[PDB]
Amino acid sequence: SLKNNSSIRNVIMSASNANDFQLTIVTCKQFPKLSCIQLNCIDTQFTKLLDDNPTEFDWPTYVDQNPLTMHKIIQLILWSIHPSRQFDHYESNQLVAKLLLLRINSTDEDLHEFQIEDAIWSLVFQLAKNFSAQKRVVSYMMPSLYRLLNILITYGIIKVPTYIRKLISSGLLYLQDSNDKFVHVQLLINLKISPLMKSQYNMVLRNVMEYDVKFYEIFNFDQLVEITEQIKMRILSNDITNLQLSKTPLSIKIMVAEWYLSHLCSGILSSVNRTVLLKIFKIFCIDLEVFHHFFKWIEFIVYHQLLSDIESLEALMDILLCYQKLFSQFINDHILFTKTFIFIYKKVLKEKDVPAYNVTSFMPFWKFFMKNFPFVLKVDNDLRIELQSVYNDEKLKTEKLKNDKSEVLKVYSMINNSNQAVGQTWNFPEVFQVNIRFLLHNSEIIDTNTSKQFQKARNNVMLLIATNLKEYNKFMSIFLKRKDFTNKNLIQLISLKLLTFEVTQNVLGLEYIIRLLPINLENNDGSYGLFLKYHKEQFIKSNFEKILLTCYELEKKYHGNECEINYYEILLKILITYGSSPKLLATSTKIIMLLLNDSVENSSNILVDEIDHVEYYVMMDFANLWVFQAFTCFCIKKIMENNEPAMAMEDLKNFIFQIIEITNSNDLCSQIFDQLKDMQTIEMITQIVEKDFCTSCLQNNNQKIDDNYIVVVIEIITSLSMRFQRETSGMIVISMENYHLLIKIIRQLSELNEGNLSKREIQIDAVLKIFSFHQDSIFQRIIADLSADKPTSPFIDSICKLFDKISFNLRLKLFLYEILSSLKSFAIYSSTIDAPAFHTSGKVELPKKLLNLPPFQVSSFVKET
């Protein structure tokens, strides 16, 4: 409510980001300016995945501001962090679209988005390295928005008309204007019948000095032929090459996917094994047909079932899908489909029948679904019991021998005794030799070996652990080979518990270019799990700094890991803790420059000696990815506060805070910065944050003190002050502390000044009232004032009481809200006095005057109006 005035001011507005002069030297990238912060909203988005975020946002009417802001967040920071981010954004937009009551502020939103996309092109301009990365990354975000936007709320004709109007402006040659139109026109994914007349005509107009030139449509036909020929027979290498060739044009790939999807659906024979992984993986390369893959999977589900071993592997894909799985909305059918597979299986030779990956998915569905149905519940209950029963019967060795014998196919070599002792070595050796090459004539043997290894592990957990430990000690297996092994059967936890320093670096990043079973979840889970292990490894890794391999990799990994890791609330504290340590750890000015590296990496993310103010400006550039900025601010604040002199802290703390706030000079950004500085300070120390608030209160009082004398720039000053003061108050409330700094002289002076002139009160009433209300919001100051009256001799008048009375008299018709606040304060004061008078009564006699002024019934209520 502190920033209520600011919201009204916002109109159709746009955002342009300009690099700072200091930033240009360090090649820093500016973050597009935002009308509103909704930082809490930004924080929510990071932890939104695998939770029911959509129903809850509905509660807050942030569609006018947050939805536009949400698009920016989706575009800006997730490569692997938010796989379902564009889809999630579409869902958010879709929800808003569904909840439509008026034509106004609905259809236009799309127009505004188009304008924003156009704005991204403007930012790139000509020959700007910093601008290009932002614009280029912005161009990719715009392409994703165009795919999502086109499907639910976009017009092919309206977009074309806007582009035509735009060229007109660019009659005089402009380097920036020509490229953007061509780039956007190039992959708008328009319907073929509609697009040919319009797209070709547009190209003809821009044909001069254009590389694509004429016959853009023909290129689409040629691309479709190339995609189709490779797809029908073999051409696995060719398919990969086709994407590389077709990287330039997104639209051609989209057309090809539809043709591919139809062919897959038509074939009566069910897809199985490697082909399914290859079919989806190849399709995965083309970004546009995300839905098509899901539809194909469902149809496979709809169609006769494939091999059982493949089905287990297939679920892996579903697990990777995560939040994106929800978009398909085939969950009711899927449960039925899952049950159908359980019903369908008959001729399965695997005794173990492990369902842990499947059991985990079912558990996620129960937690995620939050609903009860007849078909779903019975199937889930039935699935848990069979796995439990096999484990209990797992100890018996006849079932183990029988399962082992079938894969082995030899009756005599049961190997029942010491199966782990010999089979594991064989499993370890047989699997290792052919997995890397992946040229085995028979697909059946590797699977059989894997099944045998799994069975042994299930049979004796302790024995399996011992065997795993033994393999590590021997160290006869290459690290590259080991990574492949970990993906399919070896446990990451065992690798994690005991590993070589060189091995640990290898363990963190795995290459999936070659076709293989998806291992996206285990790696994702470890990263999500902790911040101490990674930081510790980097620190230990950083110190050696040798051989230009592990050390080089570690620096890259740490920077990459922070960017990759989502700014979760739990994660942010860890991130702040690590960032603070990094900043705090450096003992030299040159290292200070190194942090510069982090900001550049964050604003890039592509696979003389100055002093404090430049750093403050760098902190100021930020839009949403504020964990790093917050940590830096907190460290700086802590250093300034800890000057070891009481006098020194006031001189420096006040100056630093004012400069940082003055430099920001904004609303949402300023609020975020104050909160971040406040949040970081509060997080590090509850008392230090309280100390900052007292300093802030003193700073606020000084600003408030000027108010009587200055009489100027109320709007700019109040917005920064209320927001900072409000944040401090929130922190204090959170800190469960009612303690406040004492500045009796300033509040009284302000009240007297306001009371004396009616006209003065009328001018800038909202700013004055909000400030006074914040000051009296806390009951700590009020209780102290009451004590003095009891303490003071005789019947001497109270200045504060007089000021309050004057305000009550004076505050008539200033604002509807102002009156309410005044009434509330008066009511609260009487209650406080009553609370104070709980012992024997100290006589005041000013209560009657106060009581008469505030009433909830009859004439008095009207009197307030």
DSSP, residue by residue, 111-164: HHHHHHHHHHHHHHTTT-HHHHHHHHHHHHHHHHHHHHHHHHH--HHHHHHHHH
Tell me the C-alpha distance between 744 and 249, whole Å: 69
Q: Which pair of tokens denotes residue 617?
A: 């400006």
Of the candidates 654, 661, 767, which has an alpha carbon nearest to the alpha carbon of residue 710? 767
Q: What distance lies between CA 828 and its chain's CA centroid?
A: 42
Residue 649 burial (CB count, 10 A): 16
Residue 80 buriedness (CB in 10 A; 0-12 / 13-18 / 19+): middle
Residue 209 buriedness (CB in 10 A; 0-12 / 13-18 / 19+): exposed
Q: What is the 3-state secondary structure (H, E, C) of 206-251?
A: CCCCCCCCCCHHHHHHHHHHHHHHHHHCCCHHHHHHHHHHCCCCHH
CA distance to 434, 586, 633, 677, per residue, from 630 (Å): 50, 17, 5, 6
In 266-334 the beta strands, taken as DSSP E runs, fall at: none
Return the SS3 of 272: coil
838 secondary structure, DSSP code: T
Q: What are phi and psi of 64, to 5 degrees?
A: -65, -45
- Give 751's contacts (C-beta < 8 A, 6+ positions apart): 772, 800, 803, 804, 806, 807
Tell me the C-alpha distance between 372 and 705, whole Å: 62
Tell me the C-alpha distance between 217 and 124, whole Å: 27
Tell me the C-alpha distance between 130 and 693, whole Å: 37
Q: Which pair of tokens denotes residue 626?
A: 């504020």
**CA-based angle 564:568:573, to the nearest 5?**
105
- Give 522's contacts (C-beta < 8 A, 6+ positions apart): 492
- Give 587's contacts (C-beta < 8 A, 6+ positions apart): none
Question: Residue type for 314, please?
Answer: E
Question: How many CA within 13 A on the CB side of residue 569?
Answer: 11
Tell me the C-alpha distance between 784 and 773, whole Å: 17
CA distance to 427, 429, 477, per residue, from 433 (Å): 10, 6, 10
For this entry, resolution in Å reads 4.9
Q: Is the dihedral of CA 806, 809, 814, 820 positive or negative?
A: positive
Place of tokens 């899901």: 294
Q: Are 183 and 218 in contact (CB under 8 A)?
A: no
Q: Which pair of tokens denotes residue 96?
A: 């808003």
**H-type alpha helices, 1-106:** 4-9, 21-25, 39-47, 53-57, 66-77, 85-98
- Give 398's contacts (C-beta < 8 A, 6+ positions apart): none
Q: Which pair of tokens denotes residue 709?
A: 């004398």
Q: Long-range contacts of range 517-520, CB-CB < 8 Å, 24 or more positions apart?
A: 517/277, 517/313, 517/316, 517/487, 517/488, 518/316, 518/317, 518/319, 518/320, 519/486, 519/487, 520/320
Place of tokens 């109320």: 714
Tell me the C-alpha distance between 54 and 48, whole Å: 9
Tell me the C-alpha distance between 663 and 151, whole Å: 42
Q: Which pair of tokens denotes residue 799?
A: 């200045």
Q: Which pair of tokens denotes residue 46?
A: 């990071």
Tell me the C-alpha distance between 449 and 767, whole Å: 76
Of the candidates 357, 457, 362, 323, which has an alpha carbon nearest to the alpha carbon of residue 400? 457
Return the SS3 of 61: coil
Question: How many CA within 13 A on the CB side of residue 791?
Answer: 6
Q: Long-range contacts of range 61-65, CB-CB < 8 Å, 24 or more positions apart?
A: 62/38, 63/96, 64/105, 65/7, 65/10, 65/35, 65/36, 65/38
Q: Are 563 and 602 in contact (CB under 8 A)?
A: yes
324 secondary structure, DSSP code: G
Place of tokens 């003809």: 204
Tell me the C-alpha distance between 376 and 369, whole Å: 10
Tell me the C-alpha distance between 246 and 223, whole Å: 8
The string of DSSP codes covering 130-144 is: HHHHHHHHHHHHHHH
Q: Are 86 and 126 in contact (CB under 8 A)?
A: no
Place of tokens 């592509």: 606
Tell me the C-alpha distance between 90 and 110, whole Å: 12
Tell me the C-alpha distance between 500 and 489, whole Å: 20
Of the candidates 56, 84, 517, 91, which has an alpha carbon nearest to the alpha carbon of residue 322? 84
For residues 274, 280, 286 and 292, what is the CA-based torsion angle, rounded to 10 degrees?
A: 160
Tell me the C-alpha distance between 803 and 811, whole Å: 12
Q: Are 832 and 786 in contact (CB under 8 A)?
A: yes
Place of tokens 């955002």: 15
CA diameter of the chain: 110
Of the candidates 242, 323, 229, which has an alpha carbon nearest to the alpha carbon of residue 282? 242
Q: Which pair of tokens denotes residue 542?
A: 């950083």
Q: Which residues of 258-297 are buried (b: 16+ CB within 10 A; e: fewer)?
A: eebbeebeeeeeebbbbebbebbbbbeebbbbbebbbbbb
CA distance to 4, 14, 347, per residue, from 8 (Å): 7, 16, 68
- Give 6's contacts (C-beta < 8 A, 6+ positions apart): 36, 667, 719
**CA-based angle 163:167:173, to the nearest 5?**
150
Tell me the C-alpha distance between 116 and 15, whole Å: 7
Tell me the C-alpha distance between 797 and 795, whole Å: 6
Tell me the C-alpha distance between 670 and 661, whole Å: 7
Tell me the C-alpha distance between 492 and 387, whole Å: 23
Tell me the C-alpha distance between 470 and 464, whole Å: 10
Q: What are phi and psi of 33, to 5 degrees?
A: -70, 145
Q: Are 74 and 85 in contact (CB under 8 A)?
A: yes
CA distance to 45, 190, 511, per residue, from 526 (Å): 21, 42, 17
Of the candidates 40, 37, 6, 66, which has an alpha carbon nearest to the alpha carbon of residue 730? 40
Question: Residue type for 498, please?
Answer: L
Tell me the C-alpha distance between 358 and 338, whole Å: 9
Q: Which pair of tokens denotes residue 698?
A: 């003193």
Residue 119 burial (CB count, 10 A): 18
Q: Which pair of tokens denotes residue 189?
A: 């994914």
Tell me the C-alpha distance between 77 and 130, whole Å: 16
- Give 129's contacts (C-beta < 8 A, 6+ positions apart): 27
In what helix (H) or strand (E) does residue 2 lie, and over which residues does it extend?
A: none
Angle at which helices 816-834 and 779-789 cross, to 10°: 50
Q: What distance lies between CA 532 and its chain's CA centroid?
A: 21
Q: Which pair of tokens denotes residue 336?
A: 């039925």
Tell me the C-alpha distance between 397 and 416, whole Å: 7
Q: Which pair of tokens denotes residue 15?
A: 């955002």
The string of DSSP codes covering 380-439 is: HHHHHHHHHHHHHHHT-HHHHHHHHHHHH--SS----TTHHHHHHHHHHHHHHHHHTT--
Q: Long-range contacts of range 309-313, CB-CB < 8 Å, 24 or more positions apart?
A: 309/273, 309/350, 309/447, 310/272, 310/273, 310/276, 311/341, 312/354, 312/357, 312/358, 313/273, 313/276, 313/277, 313/517
Residue 222 burial (CB count, 10 A): 12
Q: Which pair of tokens denotes residue 595?
A: 């942090």
Residue 473 buriedness (CB in 10 A; 0-12 / 13-18 / 19+): exposed
Place of tokens 């900001």: 599
Q: Are 740 and 780 in contact (CB under 8 A)?
A: yes
Q: Which pair of tokens denotes residue 69?
A: 């802001």
Length of the chain measured in residues: 865
Of the candidates 124, 212, 109, 203, which has an alpha carbon nearest to the alpha carbon of residue 163? 203
Q: Which pair of tokens denotes residue 860?
A: 């008095």
Of the candidates 38, 17, 15, which has an alpha carbon nearest to the alpha carbon of residue 626? 38
Of the candidates 648, 649, 671, 646, which has an alpha carbon nearest to the alpha carbon of residue 660? 671
- Give 76's contacts (C-beta < 8 A, 6+ positions apart): 137, 141, 623, 624, 625
The string of DSSP codes covering 289-311 is: -HHHHHHHHHHHHHSPP--HHHH
Tell me the C-alpha distance between 283 and 257, whole Å: 7
Place of tokens 């196919």: 409
Q: Which pair of tokens denotes residue 165?
A: 């109007």
CA distance to 309, 356, 379, 387, 460, per residue, from 359 (Å): 16, 5, 11, 9, 21
Q: Which pair of tokens denotes residue 381?
A: 């209950």
Q: Long-range contacts of range 457-460, CB-CB < 8 Å, 24 or more positions apart?
A: 457/489, 458/352, 458/354, 458/391, 458/394, 459/394, 459/395, 459/397, 459/400, 459/419, 459/420, 460/420
Q: Which pair of tokens denotes residue 804?
A: 């309050």
Q: Are 183 and 121 in contact (CB under 8 A)?
A: yes
The string of DSSP codes covering 630-674 is: HHHHHHHHHHHH-SS-HHHHHHHHHHHHHHHHHHH-SSHHHHHHH
- Give 811's contacts (C-beta < 8 A, 6+ positions apart): 761, 769, 818, 819, 822
Tell me the C-alpha distance between 624 and 17, whole Å: 14
- Give 39's contacts (C-beta < 8 A, 6+ positions apart): 624, 626, 668, 671, 672, 675
CA distance to 507, 528, 531, per residue, from 498 (Å): 12, 20, 18
Q: Are 317 and 283 in contact (CB under 8 A)?
A: no
Tell me the C-alpha distance between 253 and 220, whole Å: 9
Q: Is 438 left (phi over 0), alpha (psi -120 to 50) or beta?
A: left
